[PDB]
RNA sequence: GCCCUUGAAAAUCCGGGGGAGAGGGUGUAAAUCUCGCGCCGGGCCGUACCCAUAUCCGCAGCAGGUCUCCAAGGUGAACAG
RNA sequence: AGUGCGGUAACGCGACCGAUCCCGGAGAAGCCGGCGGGAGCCCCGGGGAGAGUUCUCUUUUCUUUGUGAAGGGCAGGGCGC
RNA sequence: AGGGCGAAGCCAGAGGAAACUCUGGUGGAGGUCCGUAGCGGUCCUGACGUGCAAAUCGGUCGUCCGACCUGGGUAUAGGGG
């Protein structure tokens, strides 16, 4: 029968992201001679809130080294950053917090975040809120580094690609109970139309594959192939094991 | 006719239990009654202090 | 330790607490020493550090934060900068 | 325990939400509204502005910290490690 | 009591449609529409929360009309930046440059030594 | 409008090219002197009556002097 | 005070830092983010009234529906009756 | 010699050269509570002008009793100068 | 609208050797209660049932600072939303 809620989120329309009040992307500084070879110094002009994001950001202003012009960025705030602090970054950057330097430089056991997945990408892994990666180990030839991500996975990475030292700010957000449905409503409203979520068991059998029945039951196994046409792929996708 | 009756209400009249509908706090709010008092007693205290009646430490 | 020697200075010696007053003490050329808390603003410190250099005066960076120093002067308030004009009978000045 | 035996901050919520949740909220609900000490001036004015961002009113030093505390433990432990390694590298 | 009406076709009570009561010489209370409240400029420093002195806080498209003296103050960084932040900038910028000179001197001595 | 404080000043304002009507309001206890110009309506309060009667003569070439009643 | 909510953009307008330039040579100049005065101009379209137990929509002068502003005395907690 | 001067200072005085360039501000900010100041209205005590009542009483009860914008002065607020 | 309950914080007094505890205030929290406008629409299986009305009326009801109500603008279109 129907195209199911889920198939519909792909068309955008109503399920697009809410992004009026969002303060910008939360990138790293782009690479250049100064970053590449020395270290450019900038100052943290302010620390900011960014709707739909648990991490706070940091307006960090540098000086463009070509035009007389004060360029500025939005770093995700490393925890313990503050205003009127300087934020050095580059190869020859000093290994202290809120200081973006290549993973290859920094020693083993070094905690980082906003870490570039591929060199020059401007900060992709570990940029959530209480999250960080740890630099495991370096292979000097091949110019590669092994990094342990917050998911647990131990991804291999180019030693050139940068990261900000320290963890992300605003950690332990998810320790607080929400309590009020209202409090949930207010969270997702500054994000996207994804909240009060209706269980496919509730639905009639035209709008979901679990729907219908004289008793709210699933009726088929809730685990499912991932060679599964969009419209059935519902429940537990490719679920290797399923229980507790 | 009202003016006459308001003069009765001044004398303390048509004002007993059986001609009150509001709670006491609605009729005279406790907060306001408090605000008056502080603004009186405090004013009395700093007038005393600023005549050298009472010293700093007493005042405080 | 410095807390011990200060104790005696505060008891018996002459001194002055705070930046507005100690900069006036140095500027007079009476101040024989200047204690700075560690949390003091960086501009303030460097300014004071220069004023001592011009007036050939000792500058002792205190081990503690301005709350600790004020506690260490025997005051319930907090002092970031403190000048020691005349020590009483202490050897705070060496 | 002048007014309440054992709800305090979370007496606002009344009966609602269950005992465990309300006990669980009391920890955070306190810490997040606490006024901490600005390690910059030393006044007791570090006050959470929004999640992860704490502002001294006097110092005017906005400070990226934890969600419900000026410092997470994680942040603190990470700080010391980085300081140790920094010293190990440079000597 | 004399009730009254808005004087313009804007019915809704909005930021644009703000009023005040006035008694005319004709002895009728009439709405006058009111001009928005102008703000004094805040400092270029960006830490000092207090707005600037000696400037006519007025709606920005007015400044046009105003004389130069209203719009600023006789100082370096006048009517752009609060004094405190100037006299800290000043002595900062000076003290910094004195240390840069001291490091230059310590560098030059080290070259002569080696 | 603009009030003026010096009898000379109002005489100078009255002597301009742009000016015209110099109407005169005997209020009792006041005797104003309202002289219109391009931009502004200048007035001058002359408390004395004989001094106002004297000034009456001192307006120059044949201006309106449209006394008010 | 509240927020795992942090609550518009832009046109337009100003201030400051800089100091490339310009001004006349001892009565004047260039200059007025010009001070005070003086002169000239401001085109185009909307502007009647109803706005609701009879000018709107519900086949109608239909107990329905349809966004706002103003808001006296008495009683009374009260924009309740 | 002369691109104005005054104030310890906050800052002031009618004007007080100046480009590309740069920095900043204003435009430009949620809701809720409490408290304070300013008006409009209400209220009370009286002055007037006109009213109604008047069998008895009522120095009565009722109406009405003004100053636009823009300037200048001064209160009155506020200041994290 | 107007009321009720009175959470944190704060003050004093009393006790306590301490830990801290009591008593009286203040304070004004909350998808808190009553209850208006608003939004809704329980029961009378009331009225009406060729109606006022192709779903209205009356009383009685739910909710009334929040997943609140609401104008205009704007987006999503038929095995599609
Ligand atoms: Mg169903
Ligand atoms: Mg199906
Ligand atoms: Mg408009
Ligand atoms: Mg000025
Ligand atoms: Mg009309
Ligand atoms: Mg009407
Ligand atoms: Mg029926
Ligand atoms: Mg019938
Ligand atoms: Mg009929
Ligand atoms: Zn400042």
Strands A223-224 and C58-61: unpaired
- Strand-pairing partners, residue A58, are A47, A75
Under DSSP, the state recorded for C67 is H
Taking only Cα atoms into account, the Rg of chain C, rounded to an integer number of angstroms, comes to: 12
Q: D65 — phi, psi (to 5°)?
A: -130, -155
Find the nucleotide nearest E49 (Cα to C1′): H80
Beta strands in A99-174 (DSSP E): 100-102, 110-113, 133-139, 144-148, 154-158, 162-165
User: Hey, which chains touch C, using 3+ CB pairs under 8 Å?
Assistant: D, E
Pairing of strands A40-48, A57-61: antiparallel
Which tokens go with B28?
């005279």
Q: At A135, phi and psi to the nearest 5?
A: -75, 115
Distances (CA, A) of A132 to D76, D79, F5: 14, 13, 78
User: Whole-number Å distance, CA E68 to C1' H17?
Assistant: 14
Among chain B residues 28-47, those with CB within 7 Å of any atom of strand I: 29-31, 34-35
DSSP reduced 3-state for C41? coil
Instruction: Determine whether the distance from the CB of E14 to the nearest atom of strand H is below 7 Å.
Output: no
Residue C8: count of CB within 10 angstroms of its CB: 15
**Measured distance CA(E78)–CA(D37) in Å, rounded:** 35
**Are D89 and A95 within 8 A, CB to CB?**
yes
Resolution, Å (one decimal) = 4.7
State residue E74 phi and psi, 5-degree precision: -75, 90
Task: Output phi, psi for B38, to 5 deg.
Answer: -55, -50
Contact E5, E16 (CB under 8 A): no
Distance CA E1, CA E22 (A): 15
Contacts of residue A113, Cβ cutoff 8 Å, sequence gap at least 6: A76, A78, A126, A127, A131, A132, A133, A163, A164, A166, A167, A168
What is the number of alpha carbons within 13 Å of residue A32 lying toward its C-beta? Answer: 11
**Which residue numbers come right before each break in chain F (C to N over 2.5 Å)?**
none
Burial of A37 (0-12, 13-18, 19+ CB in 10 A): exposed
Residue with tokens 């229980």: A243
Residue E36 Cβ < 7 Å to strand H: yes
DSSP, collapsed to helix, strand or coil, labels residue C83 as strand
What single string gives the DSSP state of each residue in D20-57? HHHHHHHHHHHHHH--B--TTT--S-EEEEETTEEEET
Q: Is A154 (CB) below 7 Å from strand G?
A: no
Query: What single DSSP character describes residue C1?
Result: -
Q: How far apart are CA D38 and CA A214, in angstroms?
A: 63
Given a contact cutoff of 8 angstroms between Cβ atoms, the answer to whether A109 and A101 are in contact is no
Instruction: List, in sequence order, every residue forming a beta bridge with A138; answer none if it has no partner.
Output: A145
3-state secondary structure F2-68: EEECCHHHHHHHHCCCCCCCEECCCCCCCCECEEECCCCEEEEECCCHHHHHHHHHCCCCCCCCCCC
């Amino acid at each position: 029968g129907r195209v199911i809620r889920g198939q519909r989120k792909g068309a955008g329309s109503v399920f697009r992201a809410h992004v009026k009040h969002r303060k910008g992307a939360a990138r790293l500084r782009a690479v250049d001679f100064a970053e590449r070879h020395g270290y450019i110094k900038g100052i943290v002009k302010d620390i900011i809130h960014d709707p739909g994001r648990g991490a706070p950001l940091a307006k960090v202003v540098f000086r463009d080294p070509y035009r007389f012009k004060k360029r500025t960025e939005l770093f995700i705030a490393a925890e313990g950053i503050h205003t009127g602090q300087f934020v050095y970054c580059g190869k020859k950057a000093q290994l202290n917090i809120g200081n973006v330097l290549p993973v290859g430089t920094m020693p083993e056991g070094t905690i980082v975040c906003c870490l570039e997945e591929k060199p020059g990408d401007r900060g992709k892994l570990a940029r959530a809120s209480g999250n960080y990666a740890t630099v495991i180990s370096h292979n000097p030839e091949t110019k590669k580094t092994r990094v342990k991500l917050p998911s647990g996975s131990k991804k291999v990475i180019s030693s050139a690609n940068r990261a900000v030292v320290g963890v992300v700010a605003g950690g332990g957000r998810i320790d607080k109970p929400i309590l009020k449905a209202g409090r949930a409503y207010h969270k997702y409203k500054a994000k996207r139309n994804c909240w009060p979520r209706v269980r496919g068991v509730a639905m009639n059998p035209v709008e979901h594959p679990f729907g219908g029945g004289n008793h709210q039951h699933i009726g088929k196994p809730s685990t499912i192939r991932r060679d599964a046409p969009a419209g059935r792929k519902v429940g537990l996708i490719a679920a290797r094991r399923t229980g507790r | 006719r009202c003016r006459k009756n308001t003069l009765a209400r001044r004398k303390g009249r048509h004002m007993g239990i059986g001609k009150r509908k509001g709670t006491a706090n609605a009729r005279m709010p406790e907060k306001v009654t408090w605000m008056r008092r502080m603004r009186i007693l405090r004013r009395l205290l700093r007038r005393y202090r600023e005549s050298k009646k009472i010293d700093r430490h007493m005042y405080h | 330790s410095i807390n011990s020697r200060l104790q005696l200075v505060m008891k018996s010696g002459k001194y002055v607490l705070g930046y507005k007053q100690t900069l006036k003490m140095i500027r007079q050329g009476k101040a024989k020493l200047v204690i700075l808390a560690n949390n003091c603003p960086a501009l303030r410190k460097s300014e004071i550090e220069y004023y001592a250099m011009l007036a050939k005066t000792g500058v002792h960076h205190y081990s503690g934060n301005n709350i600790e120093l004020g506690t260490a002067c025997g005051k319930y308030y907090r002092v970031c900068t403190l000048a020691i004009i005349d020590p009483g009978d202490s050897d705070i000045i060496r | 325990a002048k007014r309440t035996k054992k709800v305090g901050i979370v007496g606002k919520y009344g009966t609602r939400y269950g005992a465990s949740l309300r006990k669980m909220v009391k920890k955070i609900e306190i810490s997040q509204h606490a006024k901490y000490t600005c390690s910059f001036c030393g006044k007791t004015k570090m006050k959470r502005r929004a999640v992860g961002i704490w502002h001294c009113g006097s110092c005017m030093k906005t400070v990226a910290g934890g969600a419900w505390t000026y410092n997470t433990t994680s942040a603190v432990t990470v700080k010391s490690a980085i300081r140790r390694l920094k010293e190990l590298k440079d000597q | 009591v004399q009730r009254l009406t808005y004087r313009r076709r804007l019915s809704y009570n909005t930021a644009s449609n703000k009023t005040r009561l006035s008694r005319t010489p004709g002895n009728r209370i009439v709405y006058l529409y009111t001009k928005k409240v102008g703000k004094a400029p805040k400092s270029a420093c960006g830490v000092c929360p207090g707005r600037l002195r000696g400037v006519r806080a007025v709606r920005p498209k007015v400044l046009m009309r105003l004389s130069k003296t209203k719009k600023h103050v006789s100082r370096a960084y006048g009517g752009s930046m609060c004094a405190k932040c100037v006299r800290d900038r000043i002595k900062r910028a000076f003290l910094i440059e004195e240390q840069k000179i001291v490091v230059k001197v310590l560098k030059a001595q080290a070259q002569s030594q080696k | 409008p603009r009030k003026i404080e010096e009898i000379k000043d109002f005489l100078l304002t009255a002597r301009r090219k742009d000016a015209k009507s110099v109407k005169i309001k005997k209020n009792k206890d006041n005797v104003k002197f309202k002289v219109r110009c391009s931009r502004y309506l200048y007035t001058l309060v002359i408390t004395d009556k004989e001094k106002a009667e004297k000034l009456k003569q001192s307006l120059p070439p044949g201006l309106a002097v449209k006394e008010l009643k």
